Swiss-Prot record:
The chain holds residues 1025 to 1191 of 7096 of the full protein. This is Papain-like protease nsp3. Changing T31A: In strain: Mu/B.1.621. It is a multi-pass membrane protein. Residues 1-167 form the Macro domain. It is found in: Host endoplasmic reticulum membrane. May form homohexamers. Interacts with N protein. Inhibited in vitro by GRL-0617. Responsible for the cleavages located at the N-terminus of the replicase polyprotein. Participates together with nsp4 in the assembly of virally-induced cytoplasmic double-membrane vesicles necessary for viral replication. Antagonizes innate immune induction of type I interferon by blocking the phosphorylation, dimerization and subsequent nuclear translocation of host IRF3. Also prevents host NF-kappa-B signaling. In addition, PL-PRO possesses a deubiquitinating/deISGylating activity and processes both 'Lys-48'- and 'Lys-63'-linked polyubiquitin chains from cellular substrates. It catalyses: Thiol-dependent hydrolysis of ester, thioester, amide, peptide and isopeptide bonds formed by the C-terminal Gly of ubiquitin (a 76-residue protein attached to proteins as an intracellular targeting signal).
Amino acid sequence: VNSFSGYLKLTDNVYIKNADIVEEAKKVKPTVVVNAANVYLKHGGGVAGALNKATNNAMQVESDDYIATNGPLKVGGSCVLSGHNLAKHCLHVVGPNVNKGEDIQLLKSAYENFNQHEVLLAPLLSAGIFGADPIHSLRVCVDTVRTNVYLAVFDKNLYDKLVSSFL
Ligand SMILES: OC[C@H](Cc1ccoc1)Nc1ncnc2[nH]ccc12
Ligand SMILES: [Cl-]
């Protein structure tokens, strides 16, 4: 039993809700919130901009030190950093950004990072301003993640479309 509430159950392990991931994380304070990161951990827009703003820029300060020490992530890769006031940990995951010409096949690799964590609050990787098809992102999520994932979908018409089109 966990404190996630109001989710629709899609499979044994994947749950979905129309929600603002910032407000969800503040309420649940989950063990892991997933950020839709880029390789530079520059949290400017989309989910990343919103999560960073909610931390009063502490996420960005921590991220800049991480990059100065370790260099950029790989597309498809991840790192675990602090969750600040939102969660215990933030798993920064880099899905391919179609608006940069990156390979959509890397989306499965990106979702594989979720399997290192028993329970996660997450957005759909490569959706929104990353330019991929969200119906496709949900399919890859369901077919790749085996741990318990609670997906927050920001857009209401998209949430309804994702539910009604889910196989
Ligand atoms: O796939 C990630 C989606 C993309 C999208 C599609 C339509 O609008 C946004 N973004 C988000 N999902 C959940 N919580 C969020 N908080 C701020 C942004 C955000
Ligand atoms: Cl977005």
